[PDB]
Write a protein that binds this ligand. Structure first.
Ligand SMILES: [Ca+2]
Ligand SMILES: [Ca+2]
Ligand SMILES: [Ca+2]
Ligand SMILES: [Ca+2]
Ligand SMILES: [Ca+2]
Ligand SMILES: [Ca+2]
Ligand SMILES: [Ca+2]
Ligand SMILES: [Ca+2]
Ligand code: NA
Ligand code: NA
Ligand code: NA
Ligand code: NA
Ligand SMILES: [Zn+2]
Ligand SMILES: [Zn+2]
Ligand SMILES: [Zn+2]
Ligand SMILES: [Zn+2]
Lengths: 174, 126, 124, 180, 122, 129, 179, 174
C-alpha cells in the first residue's frame, strides 16, 4: 500500500482514502482480509441473519490479483468503482459478482445462488419467491430467451431501466 | 462506525431485482486533571448511553478552554478511553480494585463488561 | 464541595419558625507534568500542603503556576486523594519512595483506605 | 439528562447548571438518588446530629414524577424554585414539604414530625447544643400565628397570606442566592 | 543508522591497493511522542518504520496521530530505540498483543528477559 | 542543593576565633528535559548534585537543541523518571514492575552505577536479576 | 504566612520561597527537632560528628520555647545572620556561645563550643591528631576578648572586642545572597 | 566538551552532535574497548569476520594510551580522515599499517593488514582467479611503493609514492 498512488489511481482524495484506510484497518488489523474475516465483517451488517454464503461470493469477486487474500488496495479500487466509477464500470462490477465461476455468462443456476445468498444475509418482512425472483430477472434481462445472460445483454438491459439507472448514479461520499 | 462504508458492496449485488449528509468527523479533546487525551468523536459515539458516549458529557465541556475537563484520575481514564477503542475493557493488574470500580461507576461503564482476559484477575483480588 | 448546593432544601423546611467565591482550576506543575484541578478540590483538606496556605511558597509569579520538583507519579495519588476521599497505595511503587512523598505533602501514613492499608502492611 | 432543555426550562444558565451537575454527580455517581443516599448526603450537613428522619420527608417531597427515585432534573427544578422562583413558588414548595401525606392540609400532628425531624438533624440533645425549647411549644407558636381562624388546620392560602404579612420571613426568601 | 560514520576508518586501510534528520512527532491519543526519523527507519516494513504510517499523517496538525493506547506505544517506540522489545510485567497479555499486531511487530521478537514472563502468563 | 542555606548557622559559631571548610553566587534556572516527548522540568542545581553523571556533568551539552532550546533524549521517558528522581531524593529506586534489563540499559546510558540503589530496592533488584 | 515573613524579615518573597523549599526538603516534617538537626549536618562534613554541636545550635533557638523549631524561627535566624546589623549578627553569636542563657561566657562553656565544632569538622580525620588542643584556643579568645581579665566575657565585652578586630568585622559584613 | 571540539577539529557543532549521537549509540559506555570495537564491525559486513582488523584499528588509536578510546580520539581521527590535509590523511593510514609503531612497514605486517581486511570483507585468501592472492597483493604494493627495493617502506617513501598515484589521490580528497 502507498497513499499518493491510490490518490492518483482512484477517484478518492487523500483525505477520503485515509478515512477509508482507518475504516479498513479497524475491521481487520491483519491488513489482509481472508474469507472468515469477510464473513464476520457482515455478521453486524444485519441482526439475526446469516451472510456466511454471500461472503464467499463477495470474496472471489475479488482475488483479482489472485494472491490468496484481499489487500486494502483491492478494497479501495472496488469501492472507487462502486461509488464513483462509470455506469459501465459499476455494472460490469456487479456482473462479475453474479458470474460466480468467471466465464462471462450468468445462468439460472448461479443467479439462484446469489439471491438465496442475500436472502440468507437478510431475513432468512418477506413474501417474494426465491425462484420467482430469478425468473423475473431472466424474463426481463435475457433478451433473446436462450436462458443465458451475457455482459452486453446485462449492460444494455439495465440502461433501458429508468430506475436501475438511478439506483447507480445518485449517492457517493466516503 | 466505519462499517457503513462496506454496505455499498452489498447494495451492488441487488441491482437487477429486489443529518442526511451533515456530520463530518473531529478529534475531541478530553482534558483529564491535566493530561490532554485526544480521540475521534466517533470513537466515543460507539457506546452511547455511557457518560462520554452520551449527551451527559456536555455538562463537562468548557466553553473557554474549548474542551471536556474531568477532575478525575488521569490514569484509570486510559482504560475507560481504551474500552471505546478496542471492544475490550481491561483490568490494569496493578491498580486497586476499589480505585477503579469507583471510576467505572462515574463514566457509566458496568463492572463486568470486562473481557475474559481480565475478569479472571478482577475476580481473584475483589 | 458541592454539598453547599443541597442546604437550601434544608433551609426551606425552617420557614415558619426557627457574592459567593467563584471557582478556578489551578495548575500544578510537577517536574513537568502539568496537573490541573478545581481550587475547591484542594481546599477539601486544608492543613495539608496543597489544601493549605503552605503551597503559596511554591507559586511561580511568572509561570503563573505552582511548581514542585517532586516525582510526578506519586503526586497522582496525592491529588487523587483530594478527589475521592480515599488515599490509595499503588501496588507497584516502593513503600519508602511514597512515604517520603506523603510526608512532604502533609498527608498522614495511614489515612489509607481499607483496600490498600492491607497491602501497605504486607510490604512495609 | 439534556443540558439545553434545563437551561430553557429552569432559571439557571448553562454555566450554573454544569456546576450543579458536577455537584450532583459527585454526591451520587449513581445518577439516581434513593432515600439512603439522601440520608447519608446530610450525614455531613451537621457533625454529630441525625438527619435520618428528615431525609425521608425530603425524599417524598420529591418523587413528583413518582418513578421510585429522584433524578437530577427533579433536583434542579427544586433548586430553581428554591433559589430563583417566585415567593409564591418558594412558599408553595415549603408547604408541600410540610404537608407530609399530600392532602393540602398541615395539622399539628405532622408539623411536630417536621420540627422533631430537623431538631434531630442538629442538636436538641447532641451533647453541647443541649436545647430546651420543646418540639411542642414550637408548633404551637406556628399555628397560633399561622392558622388564621383557629380551626387547628392550616391550608395553603392560610400559609401563603400568613407569610406575606411577615416582613422577615419575606426578605429571607428573596435575598438573591448564588449557585456558582 | 550512524554506523555509516565508522566506515571511513575501514575505507582508510584500503589506500595503497584494492539527506539530513528531523524529529518526527507521534501524537498518540493525546500524548505527543517524539523521536528521530532514523529511529523509526531502523525496522522498515513495520507500520512506523515503513510507508504505511503515511495513512495516519495529519496535514493540518502536521503530525502522525494514532487513536491507540498511549501506554503500550511506549514499548513499541522503545523497541525502535534499543533493539529489545520488552513485555511490561503489569499490562494484560491480550491488551498488548492486539497492539503489537497493529504496529506490525511480531509476537516474539521479545528479548530473553521478557519472553520468559510472556510465556508464564499467556 | 538547599543545604547551602544551613551553613551560616555553622559559620556563626566560628566568629571570635578560627584549618576550616565553613567558607555574588550563581543563578538558578529550571532546565527542560524533553524525553521522547515528555517535557521533564527540574532545577539546574538538582542536576548539578551528582556531577560526572550524564545530566550532572558537561556531557548533556551534546543533547542540547539550539532551536527547541531544550535537552532532548530519544530514550524511554518512563525509566527517566527514576533517573531524575534519583537526583531529587538521594535514593535510586527500582520500579518493581519494569524489566531489569530494560532499566540497567538506561542506567548505563545516564552514567549511574547499577547498585547505588538504596536498601529498599536493592532487595528486589537482587531477587529478579 | 509568606507576606508576613516578607515584611518582618530582610528577605524578598522570591528569596523566602527558595529558603522555604530548602527547609521543606531537609525536613518535610515542617518541625525541626534535635535529631533532624543532627543528621542535617551529617552531610555538612564527610567523616566528622556534629552530634554535640547540633545540641548547642538547637537551644540557641527554642526562643519561642514551644519544644521544637518552626520555619519562621529558622528564617529570622537567617535574616539576622545574613542581613542583620553587625550588632545583631554578633549578639546572635553570643547567645549561641552562652549555653546556659545567662549573658555570660565562661572558659567552661567556650571549651564545649570549640570541642563541639572540632568534632563536627574532624581534628583527627586526616590533618593531625589535634592542630592545637581546644584549650590553647579558648585561651587566645579570652586573653583577647575578656577586657579586664576577670575570666568572664560579657556581651558588651564581646561586642566592643569584635568591633576593634578589623577582620572579624569584614567577615561579618560581606553581602551574602540567598538565591 | 563540545565547543572545544568545534574549535580543535574540522566539524561544526551541528556535525559534532550527530557524530556524538552516533557514538553514544554504538556504545552507551562512552568508552570503547576492543570488544565493542570488534562487534561494532560485526554489522559492517554480513557473514565476514572483522575480529582481527578490530585489533589493528584499536591500537591505531590508544594515542592517549589510557587503556581505552574516548570519543574525543574518535572525532579527531574522523576529522583527519574526512577533512584533514592529504598528508594528514596519509600519515594516518601509515600509522595504521605500522602495527608495532616504529615508522617502518614491512612485508610481515602488511600481510597482516591485508589478511585482516580480507577476513572482514569475506574474500578468499585463495581464489579461482590467482591474481587475488593477498601475498600477490602485498607484492604489488611493495614493488610499487618501496622506492629503492630494500624491502622496507618508510613514511616518506609512502607519502611521495601516493602523491604520484593520480587516483590514490582523487580517492584522497572529494
Ligand atoms: Ca457463469
Ligand atoms: Ca442470451
Ligand atoms: Ca395534611
Ligand atoms: Ca384554618
Ligand atoms: Ca553562661
Ligand atoms: Ca570581664
Ligand atoms: Ca613496524
Ligand atoms: Ca625504504
Ligand atoms: Na483522486
Ligand atoms: Na435560563
Ligand atoms: Na524585605
Ligand atoms: Na570548525
Ligand atoms: Zn485484559
Ligand atoms: Zn485502594
Ligand atoms: Zn525485558
Ligand atoms: Zn526503593
Amino acid at each position: 500500500e502507498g497513499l499518493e498512488q491510490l490518490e492518483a489511481q482512484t477517484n478518492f482524495t487523500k483525505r477520503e482514502l485515509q478515512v477509508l484506510y482507518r475504516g479498513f484497518k479497524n475491521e481487520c488489523p491483519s491488513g489482509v482480509v481472508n474469507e472468515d474475516t469477510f464473513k464476520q465483517i457482515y455478521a453486524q451488517f444485519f441482526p439475526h441473519g446469516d451472510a456466511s454464503t454471500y461472503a464467499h461470493y463477495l470474496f472471489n469477486a475479488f482475488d483479482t490479483t489472485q494472491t490468496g487474500s484481499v489487500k486494502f488496495e483491492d478494497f479501495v479500487t472496488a469501492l472507487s468503482i462502486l461509488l464513483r466509477g462509470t455506469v459501465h464500470e459499476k455494472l460490469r462490477w456487479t456482473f462479475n459478482l453474479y458470474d460466480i465461476n468467471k466465464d462471462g455468462y450468468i445462468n439460472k443456476e448461479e443467479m439462484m445462488d446469489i439471491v438465496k445468498a442475500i436472502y440468507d444475509m437478510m431475513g432468512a418482512l418477506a413474501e417474494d419467491t426465491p425462484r420467482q425472483h430469478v425468473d423475473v430477472f431472466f424474463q426481463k434481462m435475457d433478451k433473446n430467451k436462450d436462458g443465458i445472460v451475457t455482459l452486453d445483454e446485462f449492460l444494455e438491459s439495465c440502461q433501458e431501466d429508468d430506475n436501475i439507472m438511478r439506483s447507480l448514479q445518485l449517492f457517493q461520499n466516503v | 462506525a466505519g462499517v457503513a462504508a462496506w454496505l455499498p458492496f452489498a447494495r451492488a449485488a441487488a441491482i437487477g431485482w429486489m443529518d442526511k449528509n451533515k456530520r463530518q468527523d473531529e478529534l475531541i479533546v478530553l482534558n483529564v486533571s491535566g493530561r490532554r487525551f485526544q480521540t475521534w468523536r466517533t470513537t466515543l459515539e460507539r457506546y452511547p448511553d455511557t457518560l462520554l458516549g452520551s449527551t451527559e458529557k456536555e455538562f463537562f465541556f468548557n466553553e473557554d478552554t474549548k474542551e471536556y475537563f474531568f477532575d478525575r484520575d488521569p490514569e484509570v481514564f486510559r482504560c475507560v478511553l481504551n474500552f471505546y477503542r478496542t471492544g475490550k475493557l481491561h483490568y490494569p493488574r496493578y491498580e486497586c480494585i476499589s480505585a477503579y470500580d469507583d471510576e467505572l461507576a462515574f463514566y457509566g461503564i458496568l463492572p463486568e463488561i470486562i473481557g475474559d482476559c481480565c475478569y479472571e484477575e478482577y475476580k481473584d483480588r475483589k
